[PDB]
Design an enzyme around this catalytic site. Structure first.
Site, PDB file in Angstrom:
ATOM      1  N   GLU A   1       0.804  -1.220   0.000  1.00  0.00           N
ATOM      2  CA  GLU A   1       0.000   0.000   0.000  1.00  0.00           C
ATOM      3  C   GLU A   1       0.839   1.274   0.000  1.00  0.00           C
ATOM      4  O   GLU A   1       0.464   2.263  -0.621  1.00  0.00           O
ATOM      5  CB  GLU A   1      -1.003   0.004   1.168  1.00  0.00           C
ATOM      6  CG  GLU A   1      -1.916  -1.259   1.196  1.00  0.00           C
ATOM      7  CD  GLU A   1      -2.766  -1.481  -0.041  1.00  0.00           C
ATOM      8  OE1 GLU A   1      -2.937  -0.552  -0.848  1.00  0.00           O
ATOM      9  OE2 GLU A   1      -3.272  -2.611  -0.197  1.00  0.00           O
TER      10      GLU A   1
ATOM     11  N   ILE B   1      -5.137   0.056 -10.771  1.00  0.00           N
ATOM     12  CA  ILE B   1      -4.699  -1.220 -10.213  1.00  0.00           C
ATOM     13  C   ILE B   1      -5.572  -1.609  -9.017  1.00  0.00           C
ATOM     14  O   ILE B   1      -5.115  -1.514  -7.874  1.00  0.00           O
ATOM     15  CB  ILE B   1      -3.211  -1.187  -9.766  1.00  0.00           C
ATOM     16  CG1 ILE B   1      -2.313  -0.571 -10.853  1.00  0.00           C
ATOM     17  CG2 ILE B   1      -2.722  -2.608  -9.402  1.00  0.00           C
ATOM     18  CD1 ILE B   1      -0.882  -0.346 -10.334  1.00  0.00           C
ATOM     19  N   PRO B   2      -6.804  -2.024  -9.259  1.00  0.00           N
ATOM     20  CA  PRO B   2      -7.644  -2.483  -8.137  1.00  0.00           C
ATOM     21  C   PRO B   2      -6.999  -3.702  -7.511  1.00  0.00           C
ATOM     22  O   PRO B   2      -6.443  -4.558  -8.208  1.00  0.00           O
ATOM     23  CB  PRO B   2      -8.983  -2.838  -8.791  1.00  0.00           C
ATOM     24  CG  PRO B   2      -8.944  -2.153 -10.147  1.00  0.00           C
ATOM     25  CD  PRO B   2      -7.496  -2.109 -10.550  1.00  0.00           C
ATOM     26  N   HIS B   3      -6.997  -3.766  -6.182  1.00  0.00           N
ATOM     27  CA  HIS B   3      -6.327  -4.884  -5.547  1.00  0.00           C
ATOM     28  C   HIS B   3      -6.977  -5.203  -4.228  1.00  0.00           C
ATOM     29  O   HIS B   3      -7.714  -4.386  -3.687  1.00  0.00           O
ATOM     30  CB  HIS B   3      -4.825  -4.634  -5.391  1.00  0.00           C
ATOM     31  CG  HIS B   3      -4.472  -3.368  -4.668  1.00  0.00           C
ATOM     32  ND1 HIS B   3      -4.446  -2.133  -5.281  1.00  0.00           N
ATOM     33  CD2 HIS B   3      -4.037  -3.158  -3.401  1.00  0.00           C
ATOM     34  CE1 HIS B   3      -4.057  -1.212  -4.415  1.00  0.00           C
ATOM     35  NE2 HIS B   3      -3.804  -1.812  -3.265  1.00  0.00           N
ATOM     36  N   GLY B   4      -6.718  -6.410  -3.761  1.00  0.00           N
ATOM     37  CA  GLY B   4      -7.313  -6.866  -2.518  1.00  0.00           C
ATOM     38  C   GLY B   4      -6.562  -8.059  -1.976  1.00  0.00           C
ATOM     39  O   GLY B   4      -5.736  -8.652  -2.664  1.00  0.00           O
TER      40      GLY B   4
END
Lengths: 150, 152
Positions: free
Chosen positions: A114, B66-69
């Site tokens: 992040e 950049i969608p992320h999880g």
């Protein structure tokens, strides 16, 4: 409000007007910035060896040199603006003058991804990037860096 | 010259011409892509992508994101590329609507590789020529090689 950089990028790690010609010199000086905050040698040599794998330039004159430092308890960041851009093997072939250095501990956490995401996003913002290029005041640069939000 | 995406971004995860009205719909489509690949429930993928998105747009500007999880039970990262037929509002930092997305799912337990995977994705999407190639290339096989062999 403050972003993740506020915790890890102190005012004294915002440096401007660095006038050098070599990439090595930039990394040597980054090492001195981070020193004992860890050894300069470890920081410089890690960052430089990683740079050797592939440029950390994002294009448009910015870069995110980063590395993992054994013994480091928390992530650490620095901002360096060069007086003159230098060749950096950037993907767009433009020389680099704006760098955000990121050091992370050996033990990875979710926050590390992040933090780098936030750095890449901030440096990708065209207007923020222009502002980082021109702003003369270190306190203002530090505020911009640590309060930027998408 | 394979990069870190090669091992986690298979050809079946390169999707183009997708028409969606909204971020919700594209995250739902990402759920189906990853469920089809890995088995992870599509609604869990969608929920976790949204849980991260609510904290701040994952748009990088210039129409890319950049969608992320993070996914419980996932043993290694998964990535996918989606090109939309038309760009959609994405609350991107520059306000430009988004048409190019690289989704990244990572295990709940972080490893050093995760940061490096993100770094590689951000760098390739940050490159002007590459964005134009990703915007226009009609061949999925070629798009897949471009993504997985990209070097700075």
């Amino acid at each position: 409000s403050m972003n993740r950089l506020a915790k890890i990028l102190p005012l004294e790690n915002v440096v401007i007007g660095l006038s050098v010609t070599s990439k090595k010199r930039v990394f040597e000086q980054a090492g001195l910035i981070f020193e004992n905050q860890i050894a300069r040698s470890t920081v410089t040599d890690n960052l430089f060896a990683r740079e050797r794998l592939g440029s950390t330039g994002l294009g448009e004159g910015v870069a995110i040199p980063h590395g993992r430092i054994k013994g480091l308890k928390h992530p650490l960041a620095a901002f360096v603006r060069l007086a003159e851009p230098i060749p950096f093997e950037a993907p767009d072939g433009q020389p680099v003058s704006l760098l955000i250095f990121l050091l992370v501990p050996e033990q990875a956490t979710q926050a590390h991804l992040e933090i780098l995401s936030e750095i890449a996003q901030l440096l990708s913002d065209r207007d923020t990037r222009e502002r980082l290029h021109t702003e003369p005041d270190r306190d203002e640069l530090h505020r911009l860096l640590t309060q930027w939000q998408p």
